[model samples]
Target: AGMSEAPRAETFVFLDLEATGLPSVEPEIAELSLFAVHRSSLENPEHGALVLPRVLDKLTLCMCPERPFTAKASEITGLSSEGLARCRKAGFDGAVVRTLQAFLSRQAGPICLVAHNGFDYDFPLLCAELRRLGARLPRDTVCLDTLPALRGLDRAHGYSLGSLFHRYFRAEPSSAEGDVHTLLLIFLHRAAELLAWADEQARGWAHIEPMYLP
Candidate 1:
């Protein structure tokens, strides 16, 4: 018998988002941000928008305040109740979903959303919001959650990005536990790491191509 052809590998799309809570159902969106690799060459990736809002028809900060900012949320994100109050005054514009989807449409094949602890919150949260608002996400969207994959040799606890990065790579920055910018970089790095492992699992190497979805 002839050897079977290997299935082609899909491309990647790295991203990160900072949101409000651990919602059972669709919760409010506090801030949304994304960055994409586009292609294997790694030349330039589109990075855009910071959205803060309650539930929406699309995606953005159409700010209308709800109950007082939860104390735990404020402490964890270092986004004080006061800061949220100020940002809310500006309000959402529903541009996130449009922009995000627009980016996704430009690419071919399934997309992998790279996030450090994505499975825990980012992907699920975004999915909920997308479903609730009828702005369906890409069918091939796969979250690259580095948490469980990167846990530990034996076992692990307190899966904060800061701790993991510091424990593994040594060096802890970001006073906000993991500032969005810092966390974004960690997410991308971890994604690249995962892809490396995926390649190892295969008989050949794979490349990381970042693309946006519409």
Candidate 2:
């Protein structure tokens, strides 16, 4: 029998980012959230459970972007330049990079970042921020984009995170942390199938280009 040699992800980090604006505008991350879970928890989940895994680590942060948010973006994210300034939040700088690195370092290796529409949005946007600060996630890191994954699984419904959440739980989605929670719940609900999809589809971090050009 031949042994399979494909790299497998040991940790799945559900990620979401609220940015200043859309890709065309070169938006910066205003808030980012991550929920890391061991593969064991996802692979061997409680039967039909919608709850988040017990052994999960989370990091949620809001940063003041160097650029102001567009009016539409501000309305949607509920974060404004004035509000973030009042909170004394700093831009995505070395301190924030260090914090993210430390948080990710605590997780098991071959970490796979999972995000809705991440391939086009979250992943590249994050890479752009990290690039700005001369930092990068682990070279071995991989990413699973749930947008396409879910689309491949179910073709009839909408693919937005909010749309999927509402379809599953009949509820509205919230901010970055809440969005991460919704992603986890949806993943848990379809763990076995999605895990297999991730094994086959997850792409390496280095392959993803930053949303912004240097």
Quick one: best lDDT, which candidate? 2
Clashing pairs in 2: none
- Which consecutive 10 residues in model 2 have the weakest lDDT in total? 1-10
- In the range 35-104, model 2's lDDT, one tens digit per residue, is 9999999987764436778899999999999887999999999899899889999989989999899999
Model 2 whole-model lDDT (C-alpha atoms): 0.87
Per-prediction TM-score to the true structure, in the order listed: 0.59, 0.92
**Please, what is the whole-model Cα lDDT of each candidate in the order they appear?**
0.46, 0.87
Question: Model 1, poorest ten-residue lDDT window?
Answer: 205-214
lDDT of 1 at 211: 19
lDDT, candidate 2, at 169: 79
Counting clashing residue pairs in each candidate, in order, gives 16, 0
